[PDB]
Amino acid sequence: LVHVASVEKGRSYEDFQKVYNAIALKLREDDEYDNYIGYGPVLVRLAWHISGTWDKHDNTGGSYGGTYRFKKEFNDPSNAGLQNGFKFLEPIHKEFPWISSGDLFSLGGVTAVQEMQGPKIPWRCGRVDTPEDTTPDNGRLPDADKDAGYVRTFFQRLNMNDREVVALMGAHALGKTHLKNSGYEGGGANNVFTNEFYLNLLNEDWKLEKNDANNEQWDSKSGYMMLPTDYSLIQDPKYLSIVKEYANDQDKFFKDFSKAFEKLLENGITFPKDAPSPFIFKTLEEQGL
Ligand code: HEM
Ligand SMILES: Nc1ncnc2ccccc12
């Protein structure tokens, strides 16, 4: 099962920068969503959930086919709340109907990270929409009520190693949990990409509490929370070393996140040798827009 990247006909960097800009301008303008957090975090989660269905064993799932647009995947309980991200992107897709669904969903994630003052994420085009029968079954996305061994084993299916996992999890500095979506509540209202997830893990006094959905979570008196899978990163000696590394080196974290996030968004895709190089998009700020 091979998925070969195919560039949208006649399109080049400038076309994709236009799409980036449209997403970035809407992120700035539609700023009241989720108590003024904005749509950045939910776009990051959407890009991860469309990618995180991949299975390295048979090359099913992943970002290539844009299958989140079909009912089976859209309605996966694990995807509850992402409809908000889809609705955000819908007018963009109407304005740029030539872009594939996988390209749009993945570019939304890249745009969000960069516009939230995160690292540059190189991005490649050429995902191609595939038919409804290629949609993966529900149940490929991870549970939150588990431990370090579960997280490690889960991420092996996505060909991620312990450094890649710890780096990717740093996205949990962003946004929050919502009881009605996932049965976890809280996290505050951060929409700036930093290494604070690692600093919070190490520095806060965490208490194991039960929330209103009868699930356990780790809460601090400062008002922060960690999922059981978040907290597992300081329970496992290998993960803990890496958490300490990122808490102490913002730049290293940015660089490792950039690589892991690009890999996540590209898993399963074969790029021909004559495909364009990855694009690095300018932010609105870099453009003076
Ligand atoms: C073991 C792996 C993971 C688990 C169990 C997990 C679980 C969750 C849960 C339960 C939520 C709350 C959803 C809601 O209530 O609205 C969430 C939110 C989020 N996750 Fe993850 N996640 C994992 C990995 C990741 C990865 C790898 C990324 C990105 C690189 C990511 C990015 C996000 C973001 C940005 C949000 C916030 C969404 C919002 O504010 O609407 N997560 N995650
Ligand atoms: N803001 C968050 N802090 C800790 N863990 C999380 C897990 C999921 C989403 C947001 C957070």
Curated annotation (Swiss-Prot):
Its EC number is 1.11.1.5. The keyword Signal does not apply. It catalyses: 2 Fe(II)-[cytochrome c] + H2O2 + 2 H(+) = 2 Fe(III)-[cytochrome c] + 2 H2O. The record marks R45 as: Transition state stabilizer. The modification Phosphotyrosine is found at Y150. It is found in: Mitochondrion matrix; Mitochondrion intermembrane space. It is an enzyme of class 1 (oxidoreductase). Binds 1 heme b (iron(II)-protoporphyrin IX) group per subunit. Its main location: mitochondrion. GO terms for cellular component: mitochondrial intermembrane space; mitochondrial matrix; mitochondrion. Disulfide bonds: none annotated. GO terms for molecular function: cytochrome-c peroxidase activity; heme binding; metal ion binding; peroxidase activity. The active site is at H49. Its cofactor is heme b. Heme b binds at H172. CCP1 precursor is processed by the rhomboid protease PCP1, which cleaves the N-terminal hydrophobic transit peptide. The m-AAA protease (composed of YTA12/RCA1 and YTA10/AFG3) is required for CCP1 maturation: m-AAA protease promotes membrane dislocation of the CCP1 transmembrane segment within the transit peptide to ensure the correct positioning of CCP1 within the membrane bilayer, allowing intramembrane cleavage by PCP1. GO terms for biological process: cellular response to oxidative stress; hydrogen peroxide catabolic process; response to reactive oxygen species. Keywords: Heme, Hydrogen peroxide, Iron, Metal-binding, Mitochondrion, Organic radical, Oxidoreductase, Peroxidase, Phosphoprotein, Transit peptide. Destroys radicals which are normally produced within the cells and which are toxic to biological systems. Present with 6730 molecules/cell in log phase SD medium. Belongs to the peroxidase family. Cytochrome c peroxidase subfamily. Forms a one-to-one complex with cytochrome c. This is Cytochrome c peroxidase, mitochondrial. The chain holds residues 71 to 361 of 361 of the full protein.
